[PDB]
Design an enzyme around this catalytic site. Sequence first.
Site, PDB file in Angstrom:
ATOM      1  N   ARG B 196       0.851  -1.188   0.000  1.00 50.61           N
ATOM      2  CA  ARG B 196       0.000   0.000   0.000  1.00 50.61           C
ATOM      3  C   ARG B 196       0.892   1.244   0.000  1.00 50.61           C
ATOM      4  O   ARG B 196       0.410   2.347   0.220  1.00 50.61           O
ATOM      5  CB  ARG B 196      -0.898   0.020   1.231  1.00 50.61           C
ATOM      6  CG  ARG B 196      -0.198  -0.437   2.467  1.00 50.61           C
ATOM      7  CD  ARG B 196      -0.967  -0.025   3.664  1.00 50.61           C
ATOM      8  NE  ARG B 196      -0.479   1.260   4.140  1.00 50.61           N
ATOM      9  CZ  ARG B 196       0.550   1.409   4.966  1.00 50.61           C
ATOM     10  NH1 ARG B 196       1.188   0.350   5.442  1.00 50.61           N
ATOM     11  NH2 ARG B 196       0.929   2.622   5.337  1.00 50.61           N
ATOM     12  N   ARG B 289       8.403  -7.141   7.474  1.00 51.97           N
ATOM     13  CA  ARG B 289       8.337  -6.530   8.815  1.00 51.97           C
ATOM     14  C   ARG B 289       7.069  -5.715   8.997  1.00 51.97           C
ATOM     15  O   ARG B 289       6.667  -4.992   8.098  1.00 51.97           O
ATOM     16  CB  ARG B 289       9.539  -5.607   9.061  1.00 51.97           C
ATOM     17  CG  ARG B 289       9.725  -5.232  10.526  1.00 51.97           C
ATOM     18  CD  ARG B 289      10.517  -3.946  10.708  1.00 51.97           C
ATOM     19  NE  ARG B 289       9.678  -2.768  10.458  1.00 51.97           N
ATOM     20  CZ  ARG B 289       9.428  -2.233   9.255  1.00 51.97           C
ATOM     21  NH1 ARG B 289       9.973  -2.737   8.150  1.00 51.97           N
ATOM     22  NH2 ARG B 289       8.642  -1.165   9.155  1.00 51.97           N
TER      23      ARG B 289
HETATM   24  N1  LIG Z   1      12.294  -2.929   4.447  1.00 50.30           N
HETATM   25  C1  LIG Z   1      11.495  -4.002   4.494  1.00 50.30           C
HETATM   26  N2  LIG Z   1      11.988  -5.218   4.918  1.00 50.30           N
HETATM   27  C2  LIG Z   1      11.204  -6.319   4.961  1.00 50.30           C
HETATM   28  N3  LIG Z   1       9.922  -6.213   4.571  1.00 50.30           N
HETATM   29  C3  LIG Z   1       9.379  -5.049   4.148  1.00 50.30           C
HETATM   30  C4  LIG Z   1      10.169  -3.886   4.103  1.00 50.30           C
HETATM   31  N4  LIG Z   1       9.412  -2.922   3.670  1.00 50.30           N
HETATM   32  C5  LIG Z   1       8.208  -3.414   3.430  1.00 50.30           C
HETATM   33  N5  LIG Z   1       8.200  -4.716   3.716  1.00 50.30           N
HETATM   34  C6  LIG Z   1       7.048  -5.632   3.534  1.00 50.30           C
HETATM   35  O1  LIG Z   1       6.479  -5.296   2.244  1.00 50.30           O
HETATM   36  C7  LIG Z   1       5.070  -5.603   2.257  1.00 50.30           C
HETATM   37  C8  LIG Z   1       4.221  -4.338   1.942  1.00 50.30           C
HETATM   38  O2  LIG Z   1       4.820  -3.164   2.541  1.00 50.30           O
HETATM   39  P1  LIG Z   1       3.971  -1.830   2.826  1.00 50.30           P
HETATM   40  O3  LIG Z   1       3.251  -1.425   1.619  1.00 50.30           O
HETATM   41  O4  LIG Z   1       4.823  -0.760   3.377  1.00 50.30           O
HETATM   42  O5  LIG Z   1       2.912  -2.189   3.941  1.00 50.30           O
HETATM   43  S1  LIG Z   1       1.786  -3.223   4.074  1.00 50.30           S
HETATM   44  O6  LIG Z   1       0.652  -2.477   4.912  1.00 50.30           O
HETATM   45  O7  LIG Z   1       1.222  -3.612   2.754  1.00 50.30           O
HETATM   46  O8  LIG Z   1       2.336  -4.391   4.798  1.00 50.30           O
HETATM   47  C9  LIG Z   1       4.815  -6.154   3.645  1.00 50.30           C
HETATM   48  O9  LIG Z   1       4.977  -7.580   3.672  1.00 50.30           O
HETATM   49  C10 LIG Z   1       5.892  -5.538   4.511  1.00 50.30           C
HETATM   50  O10 LIG Z   1       6.073  -6.193   5.786  1.00 50.30           O
END
Ligand SMILES: Nc1ncnc2c1ncn2[C@@H]1O[C@H](COP(=O)(O)OS(=O)(=O)O)[C@@H](O)[C@H]1O
Lengths: 510, 510, 255
Positions: B196, B289
Amino acid sequence: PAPHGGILQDLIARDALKKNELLSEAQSSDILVWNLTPRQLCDIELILNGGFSPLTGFLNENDYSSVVTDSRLADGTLWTIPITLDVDEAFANQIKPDTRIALFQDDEIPIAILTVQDVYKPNKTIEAERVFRGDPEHPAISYLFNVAGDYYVGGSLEAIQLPQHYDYPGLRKTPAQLRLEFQSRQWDRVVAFQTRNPMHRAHRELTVRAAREANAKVLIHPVVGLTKPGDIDHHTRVRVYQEIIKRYPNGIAFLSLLPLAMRMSGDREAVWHAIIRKNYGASHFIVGRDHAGPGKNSKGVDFYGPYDAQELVESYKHELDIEVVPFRMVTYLPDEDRYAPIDQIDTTKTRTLNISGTELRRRLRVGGEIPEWFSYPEVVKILRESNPPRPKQGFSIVLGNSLTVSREQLSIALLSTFLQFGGGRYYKIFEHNNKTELLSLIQDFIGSGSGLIIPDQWEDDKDSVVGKQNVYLLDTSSSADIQLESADEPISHIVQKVVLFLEDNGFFVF
Amino acid sequence: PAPHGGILQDLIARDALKKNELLSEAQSSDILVWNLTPRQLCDIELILNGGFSPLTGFLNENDYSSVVTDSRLADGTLWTIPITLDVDEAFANQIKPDTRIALFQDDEIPIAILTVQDVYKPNKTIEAERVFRGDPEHPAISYLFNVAGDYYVGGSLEAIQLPQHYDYPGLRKTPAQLRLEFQSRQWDRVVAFQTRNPMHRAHRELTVRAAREANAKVLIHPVVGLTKPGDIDHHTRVRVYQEIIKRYPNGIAFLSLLPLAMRMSGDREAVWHAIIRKNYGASHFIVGRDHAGPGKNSKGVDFYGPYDAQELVESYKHELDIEVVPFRMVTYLPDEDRYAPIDQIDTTKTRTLNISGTELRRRLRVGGEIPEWFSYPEVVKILRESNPPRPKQGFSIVLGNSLTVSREQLSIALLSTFLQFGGGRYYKIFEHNNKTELLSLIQDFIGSGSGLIIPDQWEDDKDSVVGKQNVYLLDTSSSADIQLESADEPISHIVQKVVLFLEDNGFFVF
Amino acid sequence: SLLPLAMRMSGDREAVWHAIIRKNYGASHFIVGRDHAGPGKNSKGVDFYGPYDAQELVESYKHELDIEVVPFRMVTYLPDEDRYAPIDQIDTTKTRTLNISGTELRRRLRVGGEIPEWFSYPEVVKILRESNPPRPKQGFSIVLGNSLTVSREQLSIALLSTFLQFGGGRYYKIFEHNNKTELLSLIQDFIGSGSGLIIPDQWEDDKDSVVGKQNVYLLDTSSSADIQLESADEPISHIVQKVVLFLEDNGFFVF
Ligand SMILES: Nc1ncnc2c1ncn2[C@@H]1O[C@H](COP(=O)(O)OS(=O)(=O)O)[C@@H](O)[C@H]1O
Ligand SMILES: Nc1ncnc2c1ncn2[C@@H]1O[C@H](COP(=O)(O)OS(=O)(=O)O)[C@@H](O)[C@H]1O
Ligand SMILES: Nc1ncnc2c1ncn2[C@@H]1O[C@H](COP(=O)(O)OS(=O)(=O)O)[C@@H](O)[C@H]1O
Ligand SMILES: [Ca+2]
Ligand SMILES: [Ca+2]
Ligand SMILES: [Ca+2]
Ligand SMILES: [Ca+2]
Ligand SMILES: [Ca+2]
Ligand SMILES: [Ca+2]
Ligand SMILES: [Ca+2]
Ligand SMILES: [Ca+2]
Ligand SMILES: [Mg+2]
Ligand SMILES: [Mg+2]
Ligand code: NA
Ligand code: NA
Ligand code: NA
Ligand code: NA
Ligand code: NA
Ligand code: NA
Ligand code: NA
Ligand code: NA
Ligand code: NA
Ligand code: NA
Ligand code: NA
Ligand code: NA
Ligand code: NA
Ligand code: NA
Ligand code: NA
Ligand code: NA
């Protein structure tokens, strides 16, 4: 030189000991009040500060008729542009000679007390043809018939204070102030440059050329009061001016703002400008090609000949008491990378290049490049920033009356489609529901670069409330900017038509 | 993998030959009509297309309860996020079981027919505690309490059509369509990436690592329905995804948008995401994470532990039937110029670098530079265009109630002064007259990059109508953003305080 | 290899001589192009030698020279084909050609104008611009004529302060030669260094030969003055402007 008519009529100085008293009269409960129009504000400031010397008030019928038919005040004083207080029948009927009316600014700031001499109804067609040459598309005539009151009120003025200004507090010098400025510098010879447009390489060269010709310091004296409709705004221009004054050798030029309201009256106006520059302390005045002229009319014909102004000014040469420095078309010389008066070149042998204002507006509208030789880069930057190319411009799509599809759905589809393009523009479905409060914000959003999807038209009586700039009509009609095939053309088909139109006109660039 | 529960509940396909019949019923004068809310449109699309298999409608009290207290539907099926139809008391009171309600979009497009099973008033406190962990600042809980209806309506659905979307027409692949996209390419192992947020170097790196470890093709599956309040709009994120997809080796990745409405319910949402991606045809799902976490509350405490989602998902491993590929914090190693999971480094002998979302917003807010190592340039350009620096941002200045100087004059003075600066911004003195039709436009202007000078405050009962971004109060009170020394402070003095305040906050740059 | 020869710019005769000299130095062939060793045209615009007189003279001694001459007609540039070629292998219209004469180059170098990527090599142009700087980097002298009636001490000071406000790295000085040759001979050294010299009064005619006239300008009421005064007592401020605008018109100052 001496102020026109011999005495600088600086009424602020004159009436200094009557300020308190006058201030109180204007705010009294029984006095008649007239809120000055933006053009009357420009005029009154020039009258009160001595700029319009020998004038000491708005023209009565006798001085006005003389100006109209003779280009002179009743006493023979050379004066070409009539300066009058234009009001409506309702207000006019409330006055008679000896009446003292208080003139305000914004219904709050008292400006002056006017003592009525007469109240008359000028024949606007005579004024229109005699002073402005009668062409109805002439800015001055259009204003005269569509905005100016039908009754003029002659009378003597008594100063309370010059109209208020919050921009450039230090730059709007009065004739007395400018004179001390020149004086403190021991400038006894000063050539003035009139201008309502941004200055480019050509302008910088002809002003320096005039400085060298007349052995005089340079005064850039731009108009910041009203000018020609559609001109580049005065704030953007001052920035262009303050930038170009640095391309002059140190210590040669001085910039001062002039709150004059032009009438774009070619030759007559040039005569007027000279008188005004003499009052402001200049010993010389530049009159170039089509000085103060409004160009051509919708039929492609000249309002004035390219050198009528030079000719008229030349004929009053001996009584103007200010030295005129004329110039023929100064143009660019590719082969010699320099600028020069067209009367010193050509005959073939040398090729010349020029970029008309029309060509520039267009380059600015498409984001096209503008030659290093034409203007100064930092000046072009300032211009591009305030007159952004199409992909940074605002616009509105109005869903015509003829539409049969869902207005709610067509609007949503356009909004989502536009939103996928990105590029920093802000979009909104905008419902005016025919309210003026709303209708009047349309051009504000467009001015802000936003894209407005308008669900339905506003009734004709309200049309005048909305500028039509970048406002486009989607409809089955032949007068629609974006023409629909049918009233019920499917949504997806309509969206594509609108998208490609906006791209063809540069609002979108992929 | 087989869809969760065994059958892809693709109701659009199941009800294809009932479409005309259901449309007629949906448009009958008699039928009770409910207009879907935005979240409901997101949820109804996932139910109607099989993304939520085994769900075939909105949960009845029975299933809802089970899910809240048991992370399972009544029949035992693993399911962690309640999907209900929330309505108001007025509507709920007209509902009776065995009734058929027509669900519309924008009060015009019929979406489905709902056969009611029950109407109940859920205990929102239990739901907030059991499903979203109780913090009142949790987006799901705030939504649950301030937006969601107080009554739930459980019932089975009959599809008429998926919600309408005019942006990205071919990108919202349904489970059946993606499954076909994969098959046509012979992709039998696909690891899905949820997101997202915009994707940066770290994301590209982890998705590729996932592809390599799992020996699977890549499915970038971003959420384009509702996400966290304050996220980068989906149109901008889509452009970002479309640009970054090009940085993957040719033929390794596929982009498909998911019209999911997230609940930002970390660990429970993670499981839910796994089930959803399984339904869409993925064989593997990445869980990084703080997956689907909303971060920290006011007191700076975490809504979820950075690896709770991974732990929960692991504990449901044998039930999920989709392989989870977990990742520890993926970070940058300056000295080796590469990204890597933090679990496979450090030793306190390896330097790591990271830029938090907060640090990024900020860099974007001031127009700061972004490391070429952090994200691809094309991605950053897109982000700056949509979330521009302060000198390109809009704002409003509100003349507080306390002010005793001329509001009219202070307003003009601020306008004339801002106009002196230039830089493209459009300025307007804006009178709302406390009319919400006007007040609701303030944020559109700020959104358009404009500067608004608002001469007086709006009623306290209207604040909700007006956003808070870049709106500053000019007043003598302590709550003023720009505090005046006294209500009668001279205008020029106020103007300087305002100008310097805006400079201090980056809106102006000289 | 460097040749410490003293040319006589003697066209065709010189080419013959050059060939003999190159044969002595060990060459088996010698190039003779257009106007080889010719000094161009005289003040009346006429050629000292014809463009190919040298080739002709050399051709006539061909059999006794004992060194092979490789002649060339005007090699010019071909815009449409972005290549160079002998004019005798082209034209007849059909193909447009471009050439930049030495006069055109000196001028481009004097104004700081751009010189085509196709004409010379960038690093060569750089070396040339550096040793033959454009006007705004050039030195010059303003000599206060005999006819002046205003205060020479004050006119000099005014010019010095005016010039000093422009900046741009030039160094200025009021320079009194008092007719001494030791001093008069340093004038062109300062100009060569890019400095601007304000000279309070003229040197007597017998000494004139000691001073190069390059970038040396005369302020006076005379008709032979580079910067012509209106009157002998024209006020100082008026004179300063005249001198400032002249120096700018001729590129010494660019704002
Ligand atoms: N730097 C990172 N290291 C490991 N996993 C990450 C990292 N950044 C994002 N993720 C992972 O990428 C996926 C999507 O990230 P986001 O868009 O920020 O948030 S989420 O709400 O969809 O989880 C999720 O599985 C999240 O945990
Ligand atoms: N290319 C030009 N050649 C000669 N004069 C010019 C040229 N451009 C502008 N001028 C002169 O510059 C002055 C101001 O120019 P403008 O701002 O365009 O228009 S005006 O209405 O104020 O006269 C006028 O005296 C005009 O004639
Ligand atoms: N454009 C040209 N075409 C043909 N020959 C040329 C051209 N330019 C220079 N040359 C030749 O190059 C040689 C040396 O050129 P220059 O240094 O300019 O002058 S010279 O005095 O030493 O002859 C001569 O043989 C001359 O004729
Ligand atoms: Ca009328
Ligand atoms: Ca013409
Ligand atoms: Ca039809
Ligand atoms: Ca409630
Ligand atoms: Ca933490
Ligand atoms: Ca007070
Ligand atoms: Ca010749
Ligand atoms: Ca004299
Ligand atoms: Mg004023
Ligand atoms: Mg949809
Ligand atoms: Na006089
Ligand atoms: Na008022
Ligand atoms: Na004429
Ligand atoms: Na006279
Ligand atoms: Na004269
Ligand atoms: Na077209
Ligand atoms: Na509706
Ligand atoms: Na509780
Ligand atoms: Na595996
Ligand atoms: Na935990
Ligand atoms: Na399985
Ligand atoms: Na600060
Ligand atoms: Na010959
Ligand atoms: Na021999
Ligand atoms: Na041979
Ligand atoms: Na010249």
